[PDB]
Amino acid sequence: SSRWSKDYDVCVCHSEEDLVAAQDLVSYLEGAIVSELCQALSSSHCRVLLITPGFLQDPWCKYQMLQALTEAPGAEGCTIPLLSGLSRAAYPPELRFMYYVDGRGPDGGFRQVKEAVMRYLQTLS
Amino acid sequence: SSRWSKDYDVCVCHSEEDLVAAQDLVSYLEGAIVSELCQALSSSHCRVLLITPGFLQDPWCKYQMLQALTEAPGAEGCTIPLLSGLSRAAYPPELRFMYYVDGRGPDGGFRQVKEAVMRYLQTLS
């Protein structure tokens, strides 16, 4: 519950193919919000899933997405799916019943992602 | 932990399109194992996901699969994915890092599913 219970406020879970976009999101988020690219030993309050064509094709990415949602946004943790570079028709069906940010929104979805992160940080002590 | 902590030993989570196959699995499982088709108020020790073309296309099915795995086979609960009537190339990428039963196995995968269920029941008091 403590804002300091975790070293980072948000990390970006991405596939190698989208390194650049992920770095821009991290940059956008930090402009305070502490951000980084997600990694094995990475632990933050919020986790952004950069769901792209490369992400959906990668078995490890999909499994990570699964674990990200395993213990997260049901309503407890903070997992933010960001659909980027994908046709809506190719979106994972389950998202229809879940919260997510569309990449066609303002700032490629970056703005709503940052907002979602802040909303969650405000609920911390 | 108690074998009686739940009224059913296993329910079959399926899409309307596969009612028949689901009923045969339920029949096969019971031949003791108490089985039924999963429903809203349904709660059992094991949950079998009848992942078919219709299942993967259905947003609610996918969301249910997500919740089924939300609090389940990470290693705690009992969720058994049964891939039936699908080309391996169309399998959800995440399964590569997960346990699942292929429908091309003995008895359309029914045998290994039943075995998985029994293995789990034996760990109960």
Author numbering:
A (entry chain A), B (entry chain A): 79 to 109, 128 to 221
From the manuscript:
The crystal structure of human Mal-TIR (residues 79–221) was determined at a resolution of 2.4 Å using the single wavelength anomalous dispersion method. The protein crystals were found to belong to the space group P43212 and to contain one molecule per asymmetric unit. In comparison with the TIR domain of MyD88, Mal-TIR has an unusually long AB loop (residues 109–129) and lacks the αB helix and the BB loop. The crystals of Valkov et al. were obtained in a solution containing 10–12% PEG 10,000, 5% PEG 3,350, 0.2 M NaCl, 0.1 M Tris-HCl (pH 7.3), and 20 mM DTT and diffracted to 3.0 Å resolution, while the crystals for this study were grown in n-cyclohexyl-2-aminoethanesulfonic acid (CHES) (pH 9.5), 150–300 mM NaCl, 10–20% glycerol and 10 mM DTT and diffracted to 2.4 Å resolution. Both structures of Mal-TIR identified the unusually long AB loop instead of the helix αB and BB loops in other known TIR domains and included two disulfide bonds (residues C89–C134 and C142–C174) and an additional DTT molecule that linked two cysteine residues, Cys91 and Cys157. Based on our Mal-TIR crystal structure, two possible interfaces (green-magenta, referred to as the symmetric dimer; green-yellow, referred to as the asymmetric dimer) mediate Mal homodimerization. The buried surface area, calculated by AREAIMOL, is 700 Å2 for the symmetric dimer and 500 Å2 for the asymmetric dimer. The interactions within the interface of the symmetric dimer primarily involve residues of the αC′ and αD helices of both monomers. Our results showed that the W156A and Y159A mutations located within the interface of the symmetric dimer caused a significant loss of Mal homodimer formation, while mutants D87A and R192A did not affect homodimer formation, indicating that the symmetric dimer observed in the crystal structure is related to the Mal homodimer formed in solution. In this dimer, the AB loops of the two molecules are oriented in opposite directions, facilitating direct interaction with TLR4 and MyD88. We conclude that the AB loop of Mal-TIR plays an important role in TLR signaling through interacting with TLR4 and MyD88 simultaneously.
